[model samples]
Target: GSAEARWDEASNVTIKVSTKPCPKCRTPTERDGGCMHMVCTRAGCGFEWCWVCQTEWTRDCMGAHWFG
Candidate 1:
């Protein structure tokens, strides 16, 4: 319930800033771009994540959030 409530608010407003972590690393990522695909800029983090999901990218997200 902790992290779950946080995303509920993400659906409102103009949508900015994610207080979200890179999960693969101790890093924070912002949602200033498109399609919800985030390629972490951390040193060799190379890990990509679903911007809203705040977790590793996967087919589930691709099946739904692949577009705006």
Candidate 2:
């Protein structure tokens, strides 16, 4: 399935939530908006992945819609 996008939490109505799971770690990463390029921040992980395809990013990613 496509990676999960923004979500609403009932307890935090005012807080904006944007996330996409890391392709390698499967851990949720908070997205603030911009290009889809993402790097996992987990300790010892730091795998580079995509925010749309949810896979390893490559030179081909330059053609993605989110890319500038």
Candidate 3:
């Protein structure tokens, strides 16, 4: 079993995951730019909320683990 902190902690790690920008508004994608589209980083905004569309992609809030 995993602890609550573990899950929350894991979801806060950033690994520079990039994806194709959105065709509609030229926004960065979530994963491989297929379906999981996240927010954009135009001016290094700390708030990574999607300025194009409302999405809940995991890449935006993904955690790190020792192993895959």
On TM-score, the candidate that comes out on top is 1
* Candidate 2 collision pairs: none
- The C-alpha lDDT values of all candidates are 0.67, 0.68, 0.41
Candidate 3: C-alpha lDDT: 0.41
lDDT of 1 by residue, 3-51 (tens): 8455555456565655467877848665565576776778878787766
Instruction: Give the per-residue lDDT of model 2 (tens digit) for 1-68.
Output: 65487574446456444567788777877765566667787888898766566788766765673543
Any runs in candidate 3 off by more than 4 Å, and if so which? 1-17, 32-68
Clashing residue pairs in candidate 3 are 10-63
The parts of candidate 2 lying over 4 Å away from their true place are 1-18, 63-68
lDDT of 2: 0.68
TM value for model 1: 0.58
What global local distance difference test value does model 1 have?
Answer: 0.67
The numbered model that scores best in lDDT is 2
lDDT of 3 by residue, 1-68 (tens): 76756545336546455554544444564443333324455455323333233443335444421112
